[PDB]
Amino acid sequence: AKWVCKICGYIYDEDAGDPDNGISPGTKFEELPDDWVCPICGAPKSEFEKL
Numbered sequence: 001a002k003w004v005c006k007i008c009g010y011i012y013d014e015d016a017g018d019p020d021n022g023i024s025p026g027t028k029f030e031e032l033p034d035d036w037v038c039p040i041c042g043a044p045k046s047e048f049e050k051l
């Protein structure tokens with residue numbers, strides 16, 4: 001799945017993960033740590049929407 005940051009337009013793609021911030025490819029959004037934030041704008045998880 002993909003999830004968009006409603007603040008900046010960054011797309012969290014589960015197939016890509018976010019390795020530079022400790023998230024390996026294939027990590028589901030719901031599995032992201034509670035303290036993970038948008039790598040671009042710093043928004044909390046609450047500000048993402050599933051596409």
Ligand SMILES: [Fe+3]
Pocket residue numbers: 005006007008009010038039040041042043
């Ligand atoms: Fe963002």
